[PDB]
Amino acid sequence: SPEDKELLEYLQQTKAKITVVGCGGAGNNTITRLKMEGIEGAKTVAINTDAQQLIRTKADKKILIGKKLTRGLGAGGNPKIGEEAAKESAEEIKAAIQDSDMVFITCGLGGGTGTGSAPVVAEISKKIGALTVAVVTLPFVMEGKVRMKNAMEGLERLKQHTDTLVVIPNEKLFEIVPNMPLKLAFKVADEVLINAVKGLVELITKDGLINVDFADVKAVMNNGGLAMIGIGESDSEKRAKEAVSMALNSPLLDVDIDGATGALIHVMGPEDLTLEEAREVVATVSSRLDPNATIIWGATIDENLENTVRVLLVITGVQSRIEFTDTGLKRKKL
Amino acid sequence: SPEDKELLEYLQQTKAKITVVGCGGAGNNTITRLKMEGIEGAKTVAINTDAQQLIRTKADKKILIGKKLTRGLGAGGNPKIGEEAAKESAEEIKAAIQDSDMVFITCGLGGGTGTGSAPVVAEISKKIGALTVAVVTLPFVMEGKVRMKNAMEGLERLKQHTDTLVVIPNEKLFEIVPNMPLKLAFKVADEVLINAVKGLVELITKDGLINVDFADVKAVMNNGGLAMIGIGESDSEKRAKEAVSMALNSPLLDVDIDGATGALIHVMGPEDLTLEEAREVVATVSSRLDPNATIIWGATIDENLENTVRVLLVITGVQSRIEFTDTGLKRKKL
Amino acid sequence: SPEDKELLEYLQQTKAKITVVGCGGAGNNTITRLKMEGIEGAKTVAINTDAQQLIRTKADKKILIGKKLTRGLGAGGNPKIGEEAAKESAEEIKAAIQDSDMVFITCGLGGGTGTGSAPVVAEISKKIGALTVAVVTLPFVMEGKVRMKNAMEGLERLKQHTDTLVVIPNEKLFEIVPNMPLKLAFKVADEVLINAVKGLVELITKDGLINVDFADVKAVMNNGGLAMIGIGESDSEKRAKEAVSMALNSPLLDVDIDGATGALIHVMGPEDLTLEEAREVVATVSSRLDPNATIIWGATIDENLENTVRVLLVITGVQSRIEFTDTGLKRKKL
Ligand SMILES: Nc1nc2c(ncn2[C@@H]2O[C@H](COP(=O)(O)OP(=O)(O)O)[C@@H](O)[C@H]2O)c(=O)[nH]1
Numbered sequence A, B, C: 001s002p003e004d005k006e007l008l009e010y011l012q013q014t015k016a017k018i019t020v021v022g023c024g025g026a027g028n029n030t031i032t033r034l035k036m037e038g039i040e041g042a043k044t045v046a047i048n049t050d051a052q053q054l055i056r057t058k059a060d061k062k063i064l065i066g067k068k069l070t071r072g073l074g075a076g077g078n079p080k081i082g083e084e085a086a087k088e089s090a091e092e093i094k095a096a097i098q099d100s101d102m103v104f105i106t107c108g109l110g111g112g113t114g115t116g117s118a119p120v121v122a123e124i125s126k127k128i129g130a131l132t133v134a135v136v137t138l139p140f141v142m143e144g145k146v147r148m149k150n151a152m153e154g155l156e157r158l159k160q161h162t163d164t165l166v167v168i169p170n171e172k173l174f175e176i177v178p179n180m181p182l183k184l185a186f187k188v189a190d191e192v193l194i195n196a197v198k199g200l201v202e203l204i205t206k207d208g209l210i211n212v213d214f215a216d217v218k219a220v221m222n223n224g225g226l227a228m229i230g231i232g233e234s235d236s237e238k239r240a241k242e243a244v245s246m247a248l249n250s251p252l253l254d255v256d257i258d259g260a261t262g263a264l265i266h267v268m269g270p271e272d273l274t275l276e277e278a279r280e281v282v283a284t285v286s287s288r289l290d291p292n293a294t295i296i297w298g299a300t301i302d303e304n305l306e307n308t309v310r311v312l313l314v315i316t317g318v319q320s321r322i323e324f325t326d327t328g329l330k331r332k333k334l
């Protein structure tokens, strides 16, 4: 029977179905790059309340949300509209992430479409029973108080309908290249973003020097509460050791990780990458979290990655370590 | 791309998408006429719990609701059944008004299908984020106490899922042609209805001596609370002046309009209609509402409208001026 | 018009649309038999969280629920998973029972897919406004305390989204053939089940010596609260009298029926079945319930039913007569 045959086939699926949804201009901007630089095994869905941005975007599926609310003309920086536009198009959004086993909601918090629609796309995803993960940034302080109070509130809302929520405070990007002209500001942030997102998807989707079990990912990530990134990499010949300290020290991991469970580690390096450098990476890390943290890791080889090995680090469940003030992420004072 | 092309096209839409849903026998009866006399740019959806009436109706789309509840055999005057039949067919109803920018729910309150299903079609419409407007009548007192207590309760329910709700008390039709035999009763009511409904749709959809901005309509109507009609027209040569006083005095505007915001004014007249008579119309009106009422108006020319100019008047947000007793609309006593 | 023609046709439907949904292994097992032995006018839908069982099943439609939650690999005896798998696939489940006028949810309570998914399929059915009926069993005591505490809780949950819920305690199967080896245990239970389910469907769907009005069924069954079965049959020549006492005495009707309203009686017999034996059957029964119980009955002739007449008995609204302890159905002590 065509139903039995279909059933049989189902059992043969070997790969997890990952869909990436970018919201608003920045999120669409991100989707456009993954769609070009390629995002190993993942479909891209861009959703915007602004038709012009949506149109100049490159994605697998485009959805103009808020068609009656907005008119294809933007949400004017208003999270309330981003939200209704998304609520108004729930069906359509859900129909795009419907078959995904895992869904990543990415965007720049602070605007109206992203800040308002991300929590909506997230709650819709959770309903269809998918692994809901958000890799989202916080505005630069230069952008002002209203942009951040809005970003904060969005983060809070996004917290409730998210399995794991990865926050990247653009402000620390300045702790990485101190005298950056706002120009690069958003170009650096663009980079960090595409890394955090691609680093995570491939860690789960790209064949490495280890089989990384989606069932494990789902296990851990199912409870990443509030996670934070760490990126590091060494040109030198003591790579692993330097790439993981860089990472463990990135100003992006702006949190006290001592009391942290779960972690996802992706070491990427050239063909001369060793399962041992990977392990070095993993233990230097394991050595700093709760003694029982569940750690997911993988190791992939990157063509264009010269003599270097990057080390993406996603430390989860740090929400008790942080303070959600409507002025930003404040490292908790107990 | 077919998605981009589509997106582009979207931006070119110039006309608001209006769908008119008539519920129950009277509502279906109304839809049948708009479908014939033509309702400038608006699709008609008739929904009934009675297959026989539905069948003899003329509409763009027909929906037999309550197919399992009822069996295509009516709701026997019961609002409770009108409601479940509609709740039972929500999906189907929603699929018919799904793309509308604006939805009009029309019916004769007092029966079972209309009284029960109108609030359901209204809440469904609001969910899809459309401009939900109801042009609905109240039964004649001859019909009795049960018919009205049911109509009242329906009006209340309809209040919660409606952007603006236009009430037409058939009882005042007698204040217009005093010794009317019940025959005409429903023939007069039929007229007033088709006017209130067509007058409003064309005001928004028919090209006049002024561009009427749907964005303005949505603004005002988005808050018409409880509205009431006024119809007037003058054969004479001081038209505007006579047509707007007639209107301002119609026994149908059975409410204290002094404290009213928003209003929609549609003056229709022969080709010799002036933008000035229209303005006369509008100011005589503006002069009687809150000094800051938002007034939407338009002016269209009607072929078959001899030497006359009709003046439809929809005064909104008068709900504080009225008393909802389960015996009818009582002009509030503060 | 194709819409009018369609409407017309609708009015001509003469038969109620019955869909039977079996959940989990036992439920799928049951569906497989009705699908083969044939279930007079009823479509079969098998739903399972385990692909292997689903595949070896025979049904009109198969649905693998919990595809993201479970992975086509079972629910491991967990009701919590049976539930999420079903909640996760609500749309798909609903799309299969969507046009039914009546829906039967059948399964063996105690496992994870059935116990968890039956209440979900039931609440979904009630939403589409269908006659929701469950013919479900309770585990044998040999299976242990956890299997039953889970079955009990499922029964409770199933109570809330069910029009009438028919419980068959497998434990009393031993009061019928006392020294049964667990082998037959489940083979006897298999029989009783296929009878209770087919007996009820045909009583409503198979042409007998009486027109049984679906409108009556819906009336009664709409309020069967907690029902219990009785099966009996006589080889002899005083059939009716013996078949109805057997039935009235079956250890399966483990409840005090004196205070019971409604009942459904299906007497099946050979071609020499009399409308009078049927009436004998019905009055011996009527004589023992509340003096105003609404009794639905029918009478059908069965080819392969030698000189015998079976008598299926479904006595409804006995929930006040029973005690729901998380160790089984205890005949209430007031
Ligand atoms: N990385 C990155 N962030 C951006 C970019 N443009 C804007 N943002 C950030 O994202 C936030 C929202 O901007 P935008 O994406 O335009 O918002 P929306 O379209 O209204 O949802 C801002 O507060 C910025 O910090 C961009 O090109 N790259």
Ligand SMILES: Nc1nc2c(ncn2[C@@H]2O[C@H](COP(=O)(O)OP(=O)(O)O)[C@@H](O)[C@H]2O)c(=O)[nH]1
Pocket: B023, B024, B025, B026, B027, B029, B075, B076, B077, B107, B108, B109, B110, B111, B112, B113, B114, B115, B138, B139, B140, B143, B147, B170, B186, B187, B189, B190, B193
């Ligand atoms: N204008 C108008 N009103 C009607 C007509 N028939 C009934 N009504 C009114 O509408 C109410 C409901 O009647 P009907 O449309 O038959 O109700 P339903 O079909 O049961 O929902 C009555 O109480 C009447 O006042 C009609 O032909 N024209």
Ligand SMILES: Nc1nc2c(ncn2[C@@H]2O[C@H](COP(=O)(O)OP(=O)(O)O)[C@@H](O)[C@H]2O)c(=O)[nH]1
Pocket: C023, C024, C025, C026, C027, C029, C075, C076, C077, C107, C108, C109, C110, C111, C112, C113, C114, C115, C138, C139, C140, C143, C147, C170, C186, C187, C189, C190, C193
């Ligand atoms: N009649 C019958 N009952 C069964 C059969 N297998 C299991 N059961 C009963 O149904 C309950 C659930 O078993 P199963 O159908 O495997 O559960 P599930 O697949 O996990 O939902 C058990 O506790 C048994 O009492 C069978 O073949 N026939």
